Amino acid sequence: AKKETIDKVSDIVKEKLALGADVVVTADSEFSKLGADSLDTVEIVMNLEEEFGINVDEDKAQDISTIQQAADVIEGLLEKKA
Secondary structure, three states: OOHHHHHHHHHHHHHHOOOOOOOOOOOOOOOOOOOOOOOOHHHHHHHHHHHOOOOOOHHHOOOOOOHHHHHHHHHHHHHHOO
16 A cells, blocks of 8 residues: 555544644554444544545445555555546
8 A cells, every 4th residue: 555545544543533743653553443343434434435535335444454454445446436
C-alpha cells in the first residue's frame, strides 16, 4: 500500500476520537482490537469508502488487518473504483 493511502486511512481512525495532534501514527497500529468487538467498523469502512470514494463491502471491511493491510485493500478498490 502506498504511503499516501496509509496516511489517509490512519487519519480516518484518528478523526474518530479527534487525534493526530500529539499522538504518533503507525501503519502497524492495529485499529481493530476489542475483546468484546464493541468497536464500530461500519463507521470506519464508511469513512474510508467515502473519502477515497470507492465501493467496498462489509465482508471486505470486516476482517481487515492493521492499517498496513487496510491501505493495501483500499488501493485495489481505487484502481477501478467499481
